[PDB]
Design a protein around this ligand. Structure first.
Ligand code: SAH
Lengths: 483, 15
């Protein structure tokens, strides 16, 4: 295997992944084509350029000692390899809710600012992609330090996972489970972005003089880049700068070993002490796993960006694209009412699994989307118009009973139409999970596509219920709530 | 509440 063939393949890969989107009908075929080239490149390379002699747990003591010398908490918990979530933190003593049990000073963190002062600093000053995107900057920062045997962050790097469950690691037949869903397009883009970035930075590393001292100039495999971006996207966090004037992306050692459960954010940055602080989300008895709340992310974001599917995700949602048609005779008025309300004429909204399926901004859009001309004028003219705009995203104050009946009728029909665009039904997906033995990555994809349909199904039911409530208030001639 | 709440695995744009 010659370095000339590898650069030929990366050159071919960069041209393929820089081409414009071949249309949504050819994205699956574009995906499989890109996969074929990446696997060819990957089969002619040696995997991870830097590998460590020990098992993952052999390095946790060095991580603990390294974090103690720099002022982090190391007492009260231990690293356990849990079956369900992988490695995590387990409490060695009772920990009461709201107790500050974990803190990490800024010296230990890997940040975009620490990448600027690293060997990657010179190349950072020349490449616009690095400067505009800190996530990629962190990824290459992690790589250069991984290949530096005397890096300050070596104790943390040697404890990272060696593989992930992001879609970048799925087999073709595992991703195939997602055909006809909303989620699969983000899988396509993630794979195409990653391949293009690897090939683009493979050539950048070989052409820029500022990259001559990088360890990546000696070796930089596709497996290196996939591991680094998966490490960043599953773990990274946003913290303030030391100035406090702005934000930056960071890897937080020790803290990032906690796994996810439902709850609230209990991790904040203490600018005075210049350290990350985390208080207990709930009571943790000794011998119980210590969890944190990652954030209010859907299961699609958890699968694609965090590499897992969370059962009982209370913040799950699906996307829905809506817009006011240019062929509508009331387009001008509707766009104007939307503009005065701070709502675009077309947008991607969210349907939630929550008690109301739609947010205040979606409710306001649908109300204007179904307004008569006389209703639009009352939102555009007179001393009461701005007061009408104010209540548009409020379910307690409808425009009229008829406007509500029309908007919930539309939403019931659109969500039903969306359900009919999937290859499978809900009952079919349940039978697959019940009657087949599947890998973890396969179950993620199937549960992902199941969750999309169940959110749409529930939105159909809640839209039908809401249609009947407001149709009742109309036939009974109930007075409209005001102000 | 917290001045700087920290999100584990904050979703960023990759392109
Ligand atoms: N509730 C959960 N269920 C399953 N896996 C989880 C989880 N919360 C976190 N994880 C896993 O933990 C990762 C975030 S980093 C947390 C520590 C990680 N388990 C490790 O061994 O380093 C995710 O990519 C996912 O693989």
């Amino acid at each position: 295997v010659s370095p000339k063939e590898i650069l030929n393949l990366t050159s071919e890969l960069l041209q393929k992944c820089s081409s414009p989107a071949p249309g949504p009908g050819k994205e699956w075929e574009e995906y499989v084509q890109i996969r074929t080239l990446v696997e060819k490149i990957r089969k002619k390379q040696k995997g991870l350029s830097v590998t460590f002699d020990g098992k993952r747990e052999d390095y946790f003591p060095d991580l603990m000692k390294w974090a103690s010398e720099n002022g982090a908490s190391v007492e009260g918990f231990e690293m356990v390899n849990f079956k369900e979530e992988g490695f995590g933190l387990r409490a060695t003593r009772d920990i009461k809710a709201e107790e500050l049990f974990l803190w990490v000073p800024r010296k230990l963190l890997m940040t975009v600012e620490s990448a600027k002062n690293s060997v990657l600093g010179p190349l950072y000053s020349q490449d616009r992609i690095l400067q505009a995107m800190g996530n990629i900057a962190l990824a290459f920062h992690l790589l250069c330090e991984r290949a530096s045997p005397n890096s300050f962050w070596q104790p943390y790097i040697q404890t990272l996972p060696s593989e992930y469950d992001t879609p970048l690691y799925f087999e073709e037949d595992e991703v195939r489970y997602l055909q006809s869903t909303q989620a699969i397009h983000d899988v396509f883009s993630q794979y195409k972005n990653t391949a293009r970035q690897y090939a683009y930075f493979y050539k950048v590393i070989q052409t820029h003089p500022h990259a001559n001292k990088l360890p990546l100039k000696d070796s930089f495999t596709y497996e290196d880049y996939r591991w680094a971006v998966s490490s960043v996207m599953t773990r990274q966090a946003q913290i303030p700068t030391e100035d406090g004037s702005r934000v930056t992306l960071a890897l937080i050692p020790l803290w990032d070993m906690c796994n996810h459960t439902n709850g609230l954010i209990t991790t904040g940055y203490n600018l005075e002490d210049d350290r990350c602080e985390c208080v207990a989300l709930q009571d943790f008895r000794a011998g119980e796993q210590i969890y944190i709340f990652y954030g209010t992310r859907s299961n699609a974001e958890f699968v694609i960006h965090s590499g897992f599917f969370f059962d009982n995700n209370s913040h799950d949602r699906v996307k829905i694209k809506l817009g006011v048609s240019k062929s509508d005779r009331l387009y001008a008025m509707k766009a104007e009412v939307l503009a005065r309300a701070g709502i675009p004429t077309s947008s991607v909204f969210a349907l939630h699994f929550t008690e109301p399926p739609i947010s205040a901004q979606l409710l306001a859009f649908l109300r204007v989307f179904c307004m008569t001309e006389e209703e639009l004028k009352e939102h555009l003219l007179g001393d009461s118009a701005i007061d009408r705009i104010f209540t548009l995203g409020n379910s307690e104050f409808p425009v009229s009973w008829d406007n509500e009946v029309k908007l919930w009728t539309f939403l019931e029909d659109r969500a039903s139409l969306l359900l009919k665009t999937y290859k499978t039904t809900i009952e079919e997906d349940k039978s697959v999970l019940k009657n087949h033995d599947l890998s973890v990555r396969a179950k993620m994809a199937i549960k992902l596509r199941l969750g999309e349909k169940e959110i749409l199904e529930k939105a159909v039911k809640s839209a039908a219920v809401n249609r009947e409530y407001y149709r009742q208030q109309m036939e009974e001639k109930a007075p409209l709530p005001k102000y | 509440t917290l001045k700087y709440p920290i999100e584990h695995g904050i979703v960023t744009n990759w392109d």
